[PDB]
Design a binder for these strands. Structure first.
Ligand SMILES: [Mg+2]
Ligand SMILES: [Mg+2]
Ligand SMILES: [Mg+2]
Ligand SMILES: [Mg+2]
Ligand SMILES: [Mg+2]
Ligand SMILES: [Mg+2]
Length: 224
RNA sequence: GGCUGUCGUCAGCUCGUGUUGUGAAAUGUUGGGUUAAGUCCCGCAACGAGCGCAACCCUUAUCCUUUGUUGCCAGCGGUCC
């Protein structure tokens, strides 16, 4: 991935100096106007070393789960995983989506059966008042569980945009040994993720970049 | 044992799995709104479920169909009215 490209995106940008996390000292060039700057020279080799790892999982038809619920990087997230044939989460992660599979699995069945009882027309020939609680009931399920609806079991790797914001998923993923690939940032803990990609996690330009790239490689890897 | 009063027809009382705590425990069941109501909605390390709440039951208020004696008399005709 082009080291010039990122100057363009804004990846070098971090967070205000005061909100920094001192575990990210390694991945810092310095500060300008009391605002931190990611040493991109550390980003790019780290990043390419996570693309590679992602390839060889995507090789064996494992499932890259993508998570990103920021009211920036949601439509960004959906686009990418769909542009790959994988799974995604872009509205609140709901605690135990991984550790409590048994149960959360048993709320997918419902969403399946509410999809049927919609196209099949049952959500029409009924109480009319009961096309409220038989639709809102679906609408929400397909806002939350939708992304992972046909996922049948636990992922083979989470790919996570913001570590800070999505700390619950990462802990759950550590809980299950599921390897994690995060876009950590100057203000975030390095310490829970396995393939740390430094750089900005809060920009429409920056996110699409890493997504596009991880999208490219899982498709370039889902072939051989 | 069975049956019954009572707080109280008050809106509460809990469980599975997950998570937190060395542990009793906690979370859910808190928060913003709303409601007669843990009523409903939005949020949220919770995700769900159950007993309650409400609804299904009887009665009362209006209308329609069918049936018309031992009940009824609007229009007719008669009358010991
Ligand atoms: Mg423990
Ligand atoms: Mg209580
Ligand atoms: Mg409690
Ligand atoms: Mg409490
Ligand atoms: Mg409340
Ligand atoms: Mg209830």
């Amino acid at each position: 991935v082009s080291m010039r490209d990122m100057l363009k995106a804004g990846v070098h940008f971090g967070h205000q100096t005061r909100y920094w996390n001192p575990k990210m000292k390694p991945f810092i060039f310095g500060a300008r106007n009391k605002v931190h700057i990611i040493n991109l020279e550390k980003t790019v080799p780290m990043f390419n070393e996570a693309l590679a790892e992602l390839n060889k999982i995507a090789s064996r038809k494992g499932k890259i789960l993508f998570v990103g619920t920021k009211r920036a990087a949601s439509e960004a997230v959906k686009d990418a995983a769909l542009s790959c044939d994988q799974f995604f989460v872009n509205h609140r992660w709901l605690g135990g989506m991984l550790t409590n599979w048994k149960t959360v699995r048993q709320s997918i069945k419902r969403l399946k059966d509410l999809e049927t009882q919609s196209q099949d027309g049952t959500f029409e020939k009924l109480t009319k008042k009961e096309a409220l609680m038989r639709t809102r009931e679906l609408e929400k399920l397909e806002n939350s569980l939708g992304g992972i609806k046909d996922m049948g079991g636990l992922p083979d790797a989470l790919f996570v945009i913001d570590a800070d914001h999505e700390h619950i998923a990462i802990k759950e993923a550590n809980n299950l040994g599921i390897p994690v690939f995060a876009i950590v940032d100057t203000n975030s803990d390095p310490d829970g993720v396995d393939f740390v990609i430094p750089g900005n996690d809060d920009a429409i330009r920056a996110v699409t970049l890493y997504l596009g790239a991880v999208a490219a490689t899982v498709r370039e890897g889902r072939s051989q």
